[PDB]
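Q: I'm building a small set of examples for a reading group on sequence design. Run inverse folding on the following structure and report the sequence directly after it, with nothing in between.
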């Protein structure tokens, strides 16, 4: 009944194209960008060894119920719609809390609490820990007594209201043993050898099970796992191992996902600055039917994914130009509710069958990732998928010259939602501009174009705030203060270039895009806390414009300077020799 979408393109690069990944991805960008994802087959000779032992590799498995994997179900949306309207009426506003890294599922929580007789029934019987368990929450972290605090503050008033009448007060595993699991599950399900069941068939049965309430199918995966903590599946040199000469090649390879962030065309390179949270790969161990819902990467940008081994991983891509369009059809499901909770759209996980996105006009491509293959995900390309059987994958995010302007556009969208930024985009740009040499000329060029847009935009914000009646101007070093203390009162964005402080709070802050929301305090005295005085314009635009236009003239001892300045080659250098 399910229809496989069009295949996304694969690239089988020569050993010479395979030498720089970020050059090859640029080569391919104008094309693969249109499918939103692409697959990359390294040369068959390229087979890096698997660093990790398996027999002892211990991870904590998470769980997925494919029946309830979909959070955008009709019932959950009308509940949350009705709950928000309720609170709106009460003068408050519905604010959905986060519990253990992710949003609290109120519909589940409310259902469960009410099935055992409600708040004071669960309280007096101390079953709140039983609840959080059935809600999928990891013990013994005390989530139980935390949910009670949340239910009361949020669901109890609605419980009363919805309940009869009422409502007066008050108010305001081992990788080895995992393979044994996943190979046993799959064979007993399809009654074949696990390697013998065709991709098309598992893909069909997967989407069947999602919309199928006639049967429950539970599955285990593991993720939120780092190279830092558990170690990379790749060889690489830090202190912990003598590296074998057989491995020496692959340890240094640019396709080793440990090395990508530091490649000269990567942004997270020479900045010796801060943790972005993606300079380091993550690990996904997977089963048959294990899935990952529709999503884009933080700050959009790129993700590359190597399947080290095991049965294949199915992907569904969407172009970056279809992104607004994608978000729009999902929004059609609760327009009133998504108005009040703009970011709740992203917060709610969904696997919307590609078939449904297709008939709404959204391009959806796909592919089967087979062991030893790379998948690249382009900026703001929505992706999702599932695993065919037992496997082990490794992925990192990254950023490139072409991304920079997208990254700025992302903050602006993260600013128009209420969304915490995982770092400051503008801070990044200046850290790059502050070391113009030994910076890829691609970046430098793009930086100038991108920085001049900020200087203008900032000066507009710097002169717009004085009309508002601020006088005093302090000077702070923002990068050195923790991210959550440099946020904006309601934005909520990380400030670098400038912000506004009053005496209403010793530290509470607002970016120049929302000056009126700081406090009721009249303009009167101060305080515009800035970073650079406007002596920045000549200074930093110079250093970057230097190496930017030094290369422009050089193309228009000449093969020496290119080696000293670390110019790229391909192309031009070929004519040289
Ligand atoms: C099944 C699970 C281990 C999984 C998740 C995943 C894990 C936990 C929560 C959400 C997704 N994400 C991803 C991506 C991406 N992007 C690629 N593969 N992949 C996975 O296999
Ligand atoms: Ni992803
Ligand atoms: Zn703001
Ligand atoms: Zn004030």
């Amino acid at each position: 009944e399910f229809v496989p979408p069009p295949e996304c393109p694969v690239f089988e690069p020569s050993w010479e194209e395979f030498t720089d990944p970020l050059s090859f991805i640029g080569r391919i960008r104008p094309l693969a960008e249109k499918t939103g994802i692409c697959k990359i087959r390294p040369p068959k000779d390229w087979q890096p060894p698997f660093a990790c032992e398996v027999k002892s590799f211990r991870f904590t498995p998470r769980v997925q119920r494919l029946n309830e994997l979909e959070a955008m179900t009709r019932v959950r949306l009308d509940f949350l719609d009705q709950l928000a309207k309720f609170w709106e009426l009460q003068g408050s506003t519905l604010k959905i809390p986060v519990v253990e890294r992710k949003i609290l599922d109120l519909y589940a929580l409310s259902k469960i609490v009410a099935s055992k007789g409600g708040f004071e029934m669960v309280t007096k019987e101390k079953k709140w820990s039983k609840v959080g368990s059935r809600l999928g929450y990891l013990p013994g972290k005390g989530t139980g007594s935390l949910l009670k605090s949340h239910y009361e503050r949020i669901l109890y008033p609605y419980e009363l209201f919805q309940s009869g009448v009422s409502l007066m007060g008050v108010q305001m595993y081992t990788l080895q043993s995992f393979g044994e699991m996943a190979d046993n599950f799959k064979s007993d399900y399809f009654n074949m050898p696990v390697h013998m069941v065709p991709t098309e068939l598992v893909e069909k049965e997967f989407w069947r099970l999602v919309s199928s309430i006639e049967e429950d199918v539970i599955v285990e995966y593991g993720a939120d796992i780092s190279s830092k903590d558990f170690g990379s599946g790749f060889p690489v040199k830090d202190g912990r191992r003598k590296i074998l000469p057989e491995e020496e090649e692959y340890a240094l390879s640019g396709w080793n996902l440990n090395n990508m962030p530091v490649l000269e065309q990567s942004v997270l390179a020479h900045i010796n600055v801060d943790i972005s949270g993606m300079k380091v790969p993550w690990l996904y161990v997977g089963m048959c039917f294990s899935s990952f819902c529709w999503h884009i990467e933080d700050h959009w940008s790129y993700s590359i994914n190597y399947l080290h081994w095991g049965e294949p991983k199915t992907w569904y891509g969407v172009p970056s130009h279809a992104a607004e369009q994608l978000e729009e059809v999902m929004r059609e499901l609760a327009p009133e509710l998504f108005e009040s909770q703009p970011d709740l759209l992203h917060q709610l996980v969904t696997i919307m069958n590609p078939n449904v996105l297709m008939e709404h006009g959204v391009p959806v491509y796909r592919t089967n990732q087979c062991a030893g293959e790379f998948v690249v995900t382009f900026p703001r390309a929505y992706h999702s998928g599932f695993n065919q059987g037992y496997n082990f994958a490794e992925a990192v995010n990254f950023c490139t010259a072409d991304w920079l302007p997208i990254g700025r556009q992302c903050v602006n969208h993260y600013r128009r939602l209420r969304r915490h930024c995982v770092f400051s985009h503008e801070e990044l740009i200046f850290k790059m501009a502050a070391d113009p040499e030994c910076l890829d000329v691609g970046l430098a060029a793009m930086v100038c174009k991108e920085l001049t847009l900020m200087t203008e935009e900032e000066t507009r914000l710097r002169e717009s705030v004085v009309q508002m009646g601020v006088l005093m101007s302090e000077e702070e070093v923002f990068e050195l203060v923790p991210d959550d203390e440099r946020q904006c009162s309601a934005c909520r964005t990380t400030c670098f270039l400038s912000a506004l402080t009053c005496s209403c709070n010793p530290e509470r802050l607002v970016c120049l895009y929302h000056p009126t929301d700081l406090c009721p305090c009249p303009m009167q005295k101060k305080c515009l806390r800035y970073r650079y005085p406007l002596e920045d314009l000549p200074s930093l635009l110079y250093g970057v414009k230097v190496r930017a236009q030094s290369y422009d003239t050089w193309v228009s001892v000449m093969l020496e300077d290119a080696e000293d300045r670390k110019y790229p080659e391909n192309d031009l250098f070929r004519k040289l020799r």
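The first helix runs from residue 21 to 32.
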